[PDB]
Amino acid sequence: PMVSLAQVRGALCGALLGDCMGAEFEGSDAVELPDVLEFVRLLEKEKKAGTLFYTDDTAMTRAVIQSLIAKPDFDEVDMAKRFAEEYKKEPTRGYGAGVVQVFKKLLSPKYSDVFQPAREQFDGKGSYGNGGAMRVASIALAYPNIQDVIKFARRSAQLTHASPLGYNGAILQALAVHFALQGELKRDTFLEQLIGEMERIEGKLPFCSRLKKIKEFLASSNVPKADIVDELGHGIAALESVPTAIYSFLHCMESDPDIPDLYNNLQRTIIYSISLGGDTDTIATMAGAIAGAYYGMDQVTPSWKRSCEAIVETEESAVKLYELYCKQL
Numbered sequence: 001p002m003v004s005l006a007q008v009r010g011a012l013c014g015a016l017l018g019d020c021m022g023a024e025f026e027g028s029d030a031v032e033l034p035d036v037l038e039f040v041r042l043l044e045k046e047k048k049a050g051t052l053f054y055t056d057d058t059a060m061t062r063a064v065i066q067s068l069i070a071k072p073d074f075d076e077v078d079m080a081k082r083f084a085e086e087y088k089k090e091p092t093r094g095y096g097a098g099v100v101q102v103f104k105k106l107l108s109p110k111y112s113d114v115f116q117p118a119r120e121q122f123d124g125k126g127s128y129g130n131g132g133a134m135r136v137a138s139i140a141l142a143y144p145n146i147q148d149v150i151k152f153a154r155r156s157a158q159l160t161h162a163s164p165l166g167y168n169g170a171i172l173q174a175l176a177v178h179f180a181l182q183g184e185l186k187r188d189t190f191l192e193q194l195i196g197e198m199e200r201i202e203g204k205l206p207f208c209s210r211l212k213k214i215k216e217f218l219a220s221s222n223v224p225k226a227d228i229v230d231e232l233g234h235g236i237a238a239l240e241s242v243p244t245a246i247y248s249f250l251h252c253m254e255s256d257p258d259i260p261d262l263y264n265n266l267q268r269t270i271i272y273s274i275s276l277g278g279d280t281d282t283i284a285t286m287a288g289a290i291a292g293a294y295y296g297m298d299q300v301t302p303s304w305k306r307s308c309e310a311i312v313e314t315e316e317s318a319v320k321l322y323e324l325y326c327k328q329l
């Protein structure tokens with residue numbers, strides 16, 4: 001039953017792998033599995049370590065983690081500051097065009113309410129992008145109690161994503177990591193857990209409807225990529241990416257006929273995610289966090305992880321997150 005350091009480290013390294021490997025295909029909407037498999041074989045043979053750079057997905061993840069470690073009770077003012085200073089330090093990591101404005105406003109002296117800049121986005125409608133969700137995994141790694149996971153997922157997201165689609169996408173991604181982490185649930189129970197929580201939270205019900213489609217897809221075999229993309233999405237919008245990440249994870253619990261069986265489940269998850277195209281760094285970073293939490297560090301292979309920028313720092317950070325988790329027990 002008990003959550004291991006291997007699982008927490010697995011989640012963070014999974015997220016990092018997904019971001020670093022997915023970034024290599026970002027925004028190319030048609031990705032063919034053969035290119036992904038070619039990329040992985042080349043990657044495994046690279047003599048130099050650290051050839052793949054992380055993006056805003058990981059930059060913001062690291063800022064979430066530093067906030068949780070500094071303020072374990074969750075301090076949204078501290079976290080807002082870390083987001084804004086990280087942006088300022090490394091503004092070219094690949095941030096969305098909208099969210100840049102949130103950081104500039106948080107960096108100015110005009111706002112005392114750290115949630116107000118996010119509220120003002122897109123004529124006061126707020127962002128429905130997946131940026132809240134891309135960084136949220138660590139909430140589930142720090143807070144064992146589901147009510148904490150839900151409220152802190154929401155609040156962390158609302159620093160940049162004030163639209164319900166934005167922040168509910170973050171909650172869903174946090175819940176997926178939460179349920180992956182706490183046991184090795186069977187597929188059907190995992191989805192039931194998520195659908196149950198999102199029905200309460202949303203309750204026409206956009207995320208629930210996608211989770212229902214996922215249930216249907218998993219009851220079929222040989223579902224073409226095109227049907228997954230058409231019905232779930234591969235977009236920058238949280239609605240069109242978070243369920244897709246969850247599907248990738250659940251799908252890759254079993255053999256995929258197109259992916260050689262010599263790849264483990266976590267590797268398969270990342271390969272499959274990227275093969276869906278679109279927002280590949282974010283979909284893979286989210287699917288990789290879930291898979292990492294589920295399968296743990298045993299499936300984070302040396303040849304894959306050595307390729308990623310900040311792998312050592314990431315592995316270290318897991319220990320400090322794990323301490324947060326254990327204190328909360």
Ligand SMILES: Nc1ncnc2c1ncn2[C@@H]1O[C@H](COP(=O)(O)OP(=O)(O)OC[C@H]2NC[C@H](O)[C@@H]2O)[C@@H](O)[C@H]1O
Binds near residue numbers: 057096163281
């Ligand atoms: N309400 C609304 N209306 C119209 N367009 C929107 C809206 N919300 C988001 N968007 C579009 O989504 C884009 C991204 O949203 P934003 O809030 O700027 O960024 P995120 O943090 O969600 O983006 C995360 C993504 N960017 C790089 C990352 O790896 C993720 O793919 C933004 O520039 C717009 O084109």
Ligand SMILES: [Mg+2]
Binds near residue numbers: 056282
């Ligand atoms: Mg990115």
Ligand SMILES: [Mg+2]
Binds near residue numbers: 026279280281282283
């Ligand atoms: Mg992205």
